[PDB]
Write a protein that binds this DNA or RNA. Structure first.
Lengths: 190, 93, 145
RNA sequence: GCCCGGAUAGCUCAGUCGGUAGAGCAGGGGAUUGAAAAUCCCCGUGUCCUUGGUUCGAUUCCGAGUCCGGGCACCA
RNA sequence: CGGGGGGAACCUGGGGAACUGAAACAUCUCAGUACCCAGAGGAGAGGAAAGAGAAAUCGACUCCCUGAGUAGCGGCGAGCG
RNA sequence: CGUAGGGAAACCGAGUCCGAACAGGGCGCGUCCGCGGCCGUGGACCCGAAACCGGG
RNA sequence: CUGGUGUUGGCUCUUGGUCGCGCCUGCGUAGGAUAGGUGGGAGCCUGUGAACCCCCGCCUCCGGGUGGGGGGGAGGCGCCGGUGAAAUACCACCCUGGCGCGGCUGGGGGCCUAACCCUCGGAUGGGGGGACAGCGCUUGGCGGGCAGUUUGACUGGGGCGG
RNA sequence: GGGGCCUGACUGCGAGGCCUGCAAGCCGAGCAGGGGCGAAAGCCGGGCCUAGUGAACCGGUGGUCCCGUGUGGAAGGGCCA
């Protein structure tokens, strides 16, 4: 109407099952694309941001409590490497990549915000917020959204997640917005 | 021949044969390989029409056909008849 | 091709309808068969003039009926017929009714636009309806002497 | 110069709509026969031209180098 | 009432060549020339900006001198302008 | 026309062009009229084709 | 000769391409079974009448998949579980192929008559042909029937040869 | 002939000559840039030398201080290759 009306969700009970969907170019040029691993978003959304990180035996204190729950160390590296029906994500600092034991038996991990010692640091807001989704053969898009109690707090994806549109080199025009799920669907410009 | 309405008449034009890649593409450019005189005719057609009593045809270029159905509408407000198929057309302007 | 109809037709009909067609059709069919005419503004405005006239010229005979309704819709007639008992000796057709009502109130009436079946032939109370379109039921009273 | 089509066993060539590599013929042995064919049986041949990549894998999907096959142009 | 036909050139319009030049030749040139037709008149055409073109610009058209063999056009040839 | 040249140009100027360059090197001091020689354009020293085109 | 357009019209049958939208679509191995991808996702469906049985279309890998209509009655699904690369309900963008109506333009096939065209003891009409043919503009092609031309030099004459 | 490091099969210039109707053809010391080999002196602007070539015009690429039809940009030109 005169803007993209989130409070036009006025279909069951507790609503955090709304979404943002779209489409773009198919194998544009020759590679593909990649979303911002947990887009920081102008709202922390107060979500239980499950960070199943890849810390050391030293980051068991504050790698958890920077807007998350559980974090392990060397006890989930080599001990949880032999499990195919049981056993967000930070990254081991400097350069110690996770495909030496944690790619054994496509997931979801870019990195965590820098500090060189802590995670819940002397300035920590962008660390518990919105989601991300990479390629998808046909289309792509497909992200999460927001909570049931939010007037203006839901319209946070106009120049943020719908401006994740910064990894589509060339093909056509990388936008075909269509938001809302588990009830209905509205579609809007960004 | 000529349009009785418009005055249009066959005009003389050239027929130019060319060859070559247009400069605006691959280039070198085109080369006229023969020009020659020829004419373009107006698209003349036939319009039989009732009007007053008598039948009256026009020789007229297709572009101008409607212009006749204008006259027939302008012709209603007139005193006419008197065995005059051709003498109508004349008076039909 | 813009044209205004006359003789209604299939796919395009009731007179005076402006509708668009193939110039070949108009030109080699409708116009020469007088089944429609060019939708020239010359004619188009003359069409407006057929409507604007008749149309409103007909809210006369409609608003004039209600101007005559608001005199007899309430007013009474009263006929001093020469009758015997409850039954009457002669009848009372409208040529009487209409006439009596002229010489009783100075108003003209058609013996035709009534709502009459039989000629009464019977003393009592009756109130018939009039015509056309919206209708005006006049009130009448039957008597003796 | 630019757009098409192709490559799979010795030869000519089929196909998952991403999960099987196959006809036919030549080629070698066996049955038939006065014979040579045509017959009938059995057995060999696979960088599926090339590295990459999508994906749980690929022989068909995509980028690609490559060689032939056409096709349409152009040539101061 | 008009028309018609004539008139040395000159004018406008409708049609419109070739030799030639390019040291051959086709694009190009000769040339919208020659010629044919129609029309006009003492002249004809044109003529009061839906113009020019870079100037707070000029102000119908025609003719002469300039501008200038410049601007350009051109098998960027011949040459045209 | 001449009093200014260089550069394709923007431009700069007794200089300027290439060049990164206080290397090098390239280009960088009358008109008007008469007369005569010659040249270009028009037959252009005179005569001559075979032919081509238009209209009769 | 030929495509496109104009002159050029009615009425049908038939179909393409497209895009609106709405319904389907999917069966390598394991796996309840016919799992299209990626994300949501712990709640939904039912008196906005479910479980169970029959008639009935459509699709098929012949296993089932799915829709209408009848009856009926307060009960169904997912999570869990397990196998897989991916798991289930439900909602989202997302054609892999197919139908169902829409619009937009595209093609054939029929019938018509009134433009055009031929005819008729002369007709504002009657026959026949007929939206083709003819003619305008435009596209490519065939094209000594015709036109304009070109067909080099050296050379113990020219040609031939070189 | 064999080996080692290399890319001077350089960029910007060229005193001066050979040859010579023109236009071409050929040799060139030396200076600057930034290099290569050498301890260095020095040498390197392809190849033991003399054939392996094609003016202009017209286009194509890649560059680029330039031009850009009133102005800003385009279109299209020029310049270098």
């Amino acid at each position: 109407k005169v803007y993209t009306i989130d409070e036009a969700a006025r279909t069951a009970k507790f609503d955090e099952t709304v979404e943002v969907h779209a489409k773009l170019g198919i194998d544009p040029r020759r590679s593909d694309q990649n979303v911002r691993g947990t887009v920081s978003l102008p709202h922390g959304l107060g979500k239980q941001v499950r960070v199943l990180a890849i810390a050391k035996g030293e980051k068991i204190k504050e790698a958890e409590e920077a807007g998350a729950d559980y974090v392990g160390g060397e006890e989930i590296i080599q001990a949880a490497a032999a499990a195919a029906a049981a056993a967000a994500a930070a990254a081991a600092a400097a350069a110690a990549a996770a495909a030496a034991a944690a790619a054994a038996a496509a997931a979801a991990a870019a990195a965590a915000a820098a500090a060189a010692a802590a995670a819940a640091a002397a300035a920590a807001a962008a660390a518990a917020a919105a989601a991300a989704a990479a390629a998808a053969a046909a289309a792509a898009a497909a992200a999460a959204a927001a909570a049931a109690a939010a007037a203006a707090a839901a319209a946070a994806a106009a120049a943020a997640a719908a401006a994740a549109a910064a990894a589509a080199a060339a093909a056509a025009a990388a936008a075909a917005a269509a938001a809302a799920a588990a009830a209905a669907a509205a579609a809007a410009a960004a | 021949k000529v349009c009785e309405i418009s005055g249009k008449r066959p005009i003389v034009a050239n027929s130019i044969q060319r060859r070559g890649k247009a400069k605006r593409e691959g280039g070198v450019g085109k080369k006229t390989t023969g020009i020659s005189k020829r004419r373009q005719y107006p698209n003349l057609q036939k319009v039989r029409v009732r009007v007053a009593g008598q039948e009256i045809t026009f020789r007229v270029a297709a572009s101008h056909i409607p212009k006749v159905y204008e006259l027939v509408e302008r012709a209603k407000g007139l005193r006419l008849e008197g065995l005059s198929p051709k003498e109508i057309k004349k008076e039909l302007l | 091709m813009k044209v205004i109809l006359l003789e209604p037709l299939e796919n395009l009909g009731d007179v005076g309808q402006v509708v668009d067609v193939k110039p070949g059709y108009a030109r080699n069919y409708l116009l020469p068969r007088g089944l429609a005419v060019l939708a020239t503004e010359s004619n188009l405005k003359a069409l407006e003039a057929r409507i604007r006239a008749q149309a409103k010229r007909l809210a006369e005979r409609k608003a004039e009926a209600e101007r005559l309704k608001e005199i007899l819709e309430n007013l009474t007639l009263t006929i001093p017929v020469r009758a015997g008992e409850t039954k009457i000796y002669g009848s009372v057709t409208a040529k009487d009714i209409a006439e009596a009502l002229s010489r009783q109130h100075g108003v003209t009436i058609d013996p035709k636009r009534l709502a009459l079946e039989k000629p009464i032939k019977e003393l009592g109370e009756y109130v018939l309806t009039y015509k056309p379109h919206p209708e005006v039921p006049i009130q009448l009273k039957v008597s003796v002497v």
